[PDB]
A paper describes a structure:
Studies have demonstrated that E protein is the most important protein determing the virulence of JEV.
The overall crystal structures of JEV SA14 and SA14-14-2 E proteins were determined at a resolution of 2.2 Å and 2.1 Å, respectively, by molecular replacement methods. Structural comparison between JEV SA14 and SA14-14-2 E protein ectodomains revealed a rotation of DI and DIII relative to DII. Interestingly, the side chain of JEV SA14 Lys279 protrudes to the bulk solvent whereas that of JEV SA14-14-2 Met279 is directed to the protein interior. Accordingly, JEV SA14-14-2 monomer provides a plausible dimer (complexation significance score (CSS), 1.00) with a nearly two-fold axis while JEV SA14 monomer cannot pack to a reliable dimer (CSS, 0.00). Due to the different DI to DII orientation of the monomer, the distance between the same residue 104 of the fusion loop increases from 25.2 Å in JEV SA14 to 46.5 Å in JEV SA14-14-2 trimers, respectively. The three elongated DII domains are tightly packed in JEV SA14 trimers and separately arranged in JEV SA14-14-2 trimers. Only in the compact JEV SA14 trimer assembly, the three conserved residues Trp101, Leu107 and Phe108 of the fusion loop form a bowl-like hydrophobic cavity.
Residue numbers in the entry: 0 to 401
The structure:
Amino acid sequence: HFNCLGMGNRDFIEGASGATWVDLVLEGDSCLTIMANDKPTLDVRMINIEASQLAEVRSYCYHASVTDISTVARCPTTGEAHNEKRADSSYVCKQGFTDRGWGNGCGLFGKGSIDTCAKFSCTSKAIGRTIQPENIKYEVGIFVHGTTTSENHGNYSAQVGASQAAKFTVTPNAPSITLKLGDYGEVTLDCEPRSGLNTEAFYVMTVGSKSFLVHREWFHDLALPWTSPSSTAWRNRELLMEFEGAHATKQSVVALGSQEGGLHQALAGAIVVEYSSSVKLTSGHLKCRLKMDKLALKGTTYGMCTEKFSFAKNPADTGHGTVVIELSYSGSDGSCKIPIVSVASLNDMTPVGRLVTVNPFVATSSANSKVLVEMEPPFGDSYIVVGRGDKQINHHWHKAGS
């Protein structure tokens, strides 16, 4: 998806009268149509963002498993108990004391030392990763509103074969690019990619099948056990475990409940990203300058088409205050310019609309060729009028207000 027709989110920019630069902000779910006097109309849209080489930072356990409990006890005054599970890193251990006497195995009375261990296993974890900024790629599409049909308007191969479209990537290393556009000229797009998706504010956090963009702030004060690529064991395991009251030589150890639910109140509540060895997202923005001084019109030279047109597709509402039609030209004198205006009444044929497809034309000498035309009609009732004199055709159009 590289141009605007059919997109549900669309914005219209009026380039200044005679300006050589145009500032843009490309919304990742949107499309810009830029119009300016004496210039062909352009669509530009941010297609997606891409980051490839993600480093790992830290993982959090939100559901722990407590298994294989064991206690070593000692009689009062005989020293500190040492449980040998302390030589095993997957065990968490805590010292303690219990009441001891003749009734539970000791010859003296008083506090006897105990050492209780339990195995800590992680059952499900949220793993966070980092994007280095040198590895973000913005995919951007550009389209110039030349001759198109209903079928090929969104076909990328057709439009790039007619030199009317380009997909290109901008990176922090290559923030500018010039593309040629056939006899329409060229445009240069100068972007700001490191200040588009600020990779220093965020982590990518994979939870099960999905991943998210999370504030590093929130990711750091997660009161959960954690690991990192180089660490030997889970750390701070104890905030998912309860050492229960010790009695003689026994002590119970349980895990707390899963925090899986409590992790989904956050991330509600966060930007989803597609993750498959490389992270893809369409949400986001890119700030660009578009240079248009070497962009010029093609057409103007040509004569007007002489023969009758017909409506190959009746006008349809595009959803953004414009209507799109497809014409069929019965004539053979192409290449010729299409006579198409928007009039408010058929007796007062003063033009009142405005063409989005500026300078629409039939490119070929073949008869019954099809041309698509996008127009911005005035509010209320109007007519789309194609052709002159007895070759003329019209279609009523209504554009509602509210």
